[PDB]
Design an enzyme around this catalytic site. Sequence first.
Site, PDB file in Angstrom:
ATOM      1  N   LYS A   1       1.031  -1.283  -0.183  1.00  0.00           N
ATOM      2  CA  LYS A   1       0.123   0.141   0.098  1.00  0.00           C
ATOM      3  C   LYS A   1       0.944   1.207   0.168  1.00  0.00           C
ATOM      4  O   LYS A   1       0.518   2.103  -0.847  1.00  0.00           O
ATOM      5  CB  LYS A   1      -0.773   0.122   1.180  1.00  0.00           C
TER       6      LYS A   1
ATOM      7  N   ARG B   1      -9.802  -0.030   8.098  1.00  0.00           N
ATOM      8  CA  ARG B   1      -9.473  -1.405   8.293  1.00  0.00           C
ATOM      9  C   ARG B   1     -10.562  -2.282   8.976  1.00  0.00           C
ATOM     10  O   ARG B   1     -10.487  -3.548   9.282  1.00  0.00           O
ATOM     11  CB  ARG B   1      -8.154  -1.778   8.610  1.00  0.00           C
TER      12      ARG B   1
ATOM     13  N   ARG C   1      12.082  -6.072   5.479  1.00  0.00           N
ATOM     14  CA  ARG C   1      11.886  -4.654   4.965  1.00  0.00           C
ATOM     15  C   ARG C   1      12.713  -3.614   5.802  1.00  0.00           C
ATOM     16  O   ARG C   1      12.867  -3.927   7.106  1.00  0.00           O
ATOM     17  CB  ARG C   1      10.283  -4.285   5.254  1.00  0.00           C
TER      18      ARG C   1
ATOM     19  N   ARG D   1      11.413  -1.617  11.203  1.00  0.00           N
ATOM     20  CA  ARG D   1      10.290  -1.278  12.011  1.00  0.00           C
ATOM     21  C   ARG D   1      10.072  -2.326  12.926  1.00  0.00           C
ATOM     22  O   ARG D   1      10.183  -3.589  12.770  1.00  0.00           O
ATOM     23  CB  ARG D   1       8.767  -1.259  11.245  1.00  0.00           C
TER      24      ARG D   1
ATOM     25  N   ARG E   1      -0.260  -9.314  13.225  1.00  0.00           N
ATOM     26  CA  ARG E   1      -0.618  -8.394  12.170  1.00  0.00           C
ATOM     27  C   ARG E   1      -1.778  -9.145  11.266  1.00  0.00           C
ATOM     28  O   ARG E   1      -2.742  -8.430  10.668  1.00  0.00           O
ATOM     29  CB  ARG E   1       0.289  -7.329  11.888  1.00  0.00           C
TER      30      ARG E   1
HETATM   31  N1  LIG Z   1       5.361  -5.352  -5.706  1.00  0.00           N
HETATM   32  C1  LIG Z   1       6.206  -5.581  -4.775  1.00  0.00           C
HETATM   33  N2  LIG Z   1       6.950  -6.762  -5.068  1.00  0.00           N
HETATM   34  C2  LIG Z   1       7.940  -7.235  -3.953  1.00  0.00           C
HETATM   35  N3  LIG Z   1       8.127  -6.608  -2.805  1.00  0.00           N
HETATM   36  C3  LIG Z   1       7.418  -5.208  -2.599  1.00  0.00           C
HETATM   37  C4  LIG Z   1       6.475  -4.990  -3.448  1.00  0.00           C
HETATM   38  N4  LIG Z   1       5.798  -3.859  -3.172  1.00  0.00           N
HETATM   39  C5  LIG Z   1       6.307  -3.546  -2.054  1.00  0.00           C
HETATM   40  N5  LIG Z   1       7.171  -4.401  -1.802  1.00  0.00           N
HETATM   41  C6  LIG Z   1       7.990  -4.784  -0.199  1.00  0.00           C
HETATM   42  O1  LIG Z   1       7.128  -5.133   0.701  1.00  0.00           O
HETATM   43  C7  LIG Z   1       7.305  -4.424   2.004  1.00  0.00           C
HETATM   44  C8  LIG Z   1       6.277  -3.976   2.301  1.00  0.00           C
HETATM   45  O2  LIG Z   1       5.594  -2.941   1.469  1.00  0.00           O
HETATM   46  P1  LIG Z   1       4.811  -1.623   2.060  1.00  0.00           P
HETATM   47  O3  LIG Z   1       4.586  -0.731   0.833  1.00  0.00           O
HETATM   48  O4  LIG Z   1       5.832  -0.995   3.095  1.00  0.00           O
HETATM   49  O5  LIG Z   1       3.546  -2.347   2.552  1.00  0.00           O
HETATM   50  P2  LIG Z   1       2.247  -1.731   3.229  1.00  0.00           P
HETATM   51  O6  LIG Z   1       1.071  -2.329   2.689  1.00  0.00           O
HETATM   52  O7  LIG Z   1       2.124  -0.230   3.094  1.00  0.00           O
HETATM   53  O8  LIG Z   1       2.492  -2.503   4.544  1.00  0.00           O
HETATM   54  P3  LIG Z   1       2.381  -2.148   6.074  1.00  0.00           P
HETATM   55  O9  LIG Z   1       3.369  -3.126   6.808  1.00  0.00           O
HETATM   56  O10 LIG Z   1       3.122  -0.701   6.284  1.00  0.00           O
HETATM   57  O11 LIG Z   1       0.923  -2.244   6.687  1.00  0.00           O
HETATM   58  P4  LIG Z   1       0.628  -2.391   8.045  1.00  0.00           P
HETATM   59  O12 LIG Z   1      -0.986  -2.409   7.974  1.00  0.00           O
HETATM   60  O13 LIG Z   1       1.062  -3.501   8.805  1.00  0.00           O
HETATM   61  O14 LIG Z   1       0.914  -1.154   8.956  1.00  0.00           O
HETATM   62  P5  LIG Z   1       0.693   0.223   8.725  1.00  0.00           P
HETATM   63  O15 LIG Z   1       2.078   1.107   9.041  1.00  0.00           O
HETATM   64  O16 LIG Z   1      -0.311   0.817   7.947  1.00  0.00           O
HETATM   65  O17 LIG Z   1       0.168   0.447  10.481  1.00  0.00           O
HETATM   66  C9  LIG Z   1       0.990  -0.263  11.658  1.00  0.00           C
HETATM   67  C10 LIG Z   1       0.018  -0.417  12.826  1.00  0.00           C
HETATM   68  O18 LIG Z   1      -0.772   0.813  12.996  1.00  0.00           O
HETATM   69  C11 LIG Z   1      -2.238   0.433  13.526  1.00  0.00           C
HETATM   70  N6  LIG Z   1      -3.192   0.953  12.607  1.00  0.00           N
HETATM   71  C12 LIG Z   1      -3.068   1.541  11.273  1.00  0.00           C
HETATM   72  N7  LIG Z   1      -4.205   2.021  10.698  1.00  0.00           N
HETATM   73  C13 LIG Z   1      -5.041   1.413  11.466  1.00  0.00           C
HETATM   74  C14 LIG Z   1      -6.524   1.814  11.282  1.00  0.00           C
HETATM   75  N8  LIG Z   1      -7.182   2.206  10.396  1.00  0.00           N
HETATM   76  N9  LIG Z   1      -7.134   1.347  12.423  1.00  0.00           N
HETATM   77  C15 LIG Z   1      -6.556   0.499  13.541  1.00  0.00           C
HETATM   78  N10 LIG Z   1      -5.487   0.463  13.629  1.00  0.00           N
HETATM   79  C16 LIG Z   1      -4.536   0.947  12.915  1.00  0.00           C
HETATM   80  C17 LIG Z   1      -2.250  -0.609  13.716  1.00  0.00           C
HETATM   81  O19 LIG Z   1      -1.747  -1.250  14.999  1.00  0.00           O
HETATM   82  C18 LIG Z   1      -1.210  -1.365  12.530  1.00  0.00           C
HETATM   83  O20 LIG Z   1      -0.829  -2.503  12.498  1.00  0.00           O
HETATM   84  C19 LIG Z   1       8.615  -3.373   1.705  1.00  0.00           C
HETATM   85  O21 LIG Z   1       9.640  -3.929   2.141  1.00  0.00           O
HETATM   86  C20 LIG Z   1       8.471  -3.260   0.139  1.00  0.00           C
HETATM   87  O22 LIG Z   1       9.627  -2.718  -0.424  1.00  0.00           O
HETATM   88 MG   LIG Z   2       2.434   1.173   4.867  1.00  0.00          MG
END
Ligand SMILES: Nc1ncnc2c1ncn2[C@@H]1O[C@H](COP(=O)(O)OP(=O)(O)OP(=O)(O)OP(=O)(O)OP(=O)(O)OC[C@H]2O[C@@H](n3cnc4c(N)ncnc43)[C@H](O)[C@@H]2O)[C@@H](O)[C@H]1O
Ligand SMILES: [Mg+2]
Length: 212
Positions: A13, A88, A127, A160, A171
């Site tokens: 994302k 989400r 990552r 991270r 997660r």
């Molecule tokens: N095409 C491809 N091919 C190969 N490799 C690729 C690729 N594209 C990308 N990659 C690689 O893959 C890896 C991941 O890609 P990346 O683009 O970093 O992935 P992402 O989908 O953005 O993954 P996140 O880990 O950031 O999602 P998340 O939900 O766990 O945590 P978030 O920060 O939102 O939130 C963290 C925490 O915040 C809280 N939170 C956030 N939002 C909410 C919400 N709405 N409600 C309640 N709690 C929330 C929760 O506790 C949550 O767990 C990278 O190393 C990248 O280089």
């Molecule tokens: Mg992200």
Amino acid sequence: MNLVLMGLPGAGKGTQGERIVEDYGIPHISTGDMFRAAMKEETPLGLEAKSYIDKGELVPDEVTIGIVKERLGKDDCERGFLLDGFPRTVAQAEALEEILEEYGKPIDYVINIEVDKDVLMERLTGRRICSVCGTTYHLVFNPPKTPGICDKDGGELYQRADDNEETVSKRLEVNMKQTQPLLDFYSEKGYLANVNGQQDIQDVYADVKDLL
Ligand SMILES: Nc1ncnc2c1ncn2[C@@H]1O[C@H](COP(=O)(O)OP(=O)(O)OP(=O)(O)OP(=O)(O)OP(=O)(O)OC[C@H]2O[C@@H](n3cnc4c(N)ncnc43)[C@H](O)[C@@H]2O)[C@@H](O)[C@H]1O
Ligand SMILES: [Mg+2]
Ligand SMILES: [Zn+2]
């Protein structure tokens, strides 16, 4: 262009969001990124969210909906924005519908980036993210030109805290069981569009670019 980018942890994302917001000139609003920025500044918000984030659990809807409501009200969201990681849960989606109704900025598209869980797990345990801009890299699939530092600003890359194997597991489970109701909600509204996230960056962005 009012967009919502959904998908399980590690689906890409943030990676896709950066590209989209660069080509359309709109705010990239990541609830996860906002939480961590709040954690680094040690704001009362960061302390609250950290308890949940560190364990891989969802931050309470009350707080989460609250920050998004505020954020989406800013002037930079006037002609579009890209929501990343929100909503989400169906409660967050219903609240979002009313918030946007009031602002008069309903959702245009809800792009779900589909990726197999096995792929997800490898993308997360390799990552590295930037300590100043939050952009991410992958030691195997998308490495920084210079190991340890961000290509853009040159900040040091780190792993991270919630990317530890045990937490990555929690997660994935926590978010997988929330997908059905979310996909059903948006399929019902008719905003839903799926994309195969199991491709290389460019292909996924290519499959996305066509829509917008
Ligand atoms: N095409 C491809 N091919 C190969 N490799 C690729 C690729 N594209 C990308 N990659 C690689 O893959 C890896 C991941 O890609 P990346 O683009 O970093 O992935 P992402 O989908 O953005 O993954 P996140 O880990 O950031 O999602 P998340 O939900 O766990 O945590 P978030 O920060 O939102 O939130 C963290 C925490 O915040 C809280 N939170 C956030 N939002 C909410 C919400 N709405 N409600 C309640 N709690 C929330 C929760 O506790 C949550 O767990 C990278 O190393 C990248 O280089
Ligand atoms: Mg992200
Ligand atoms: Zn950076």
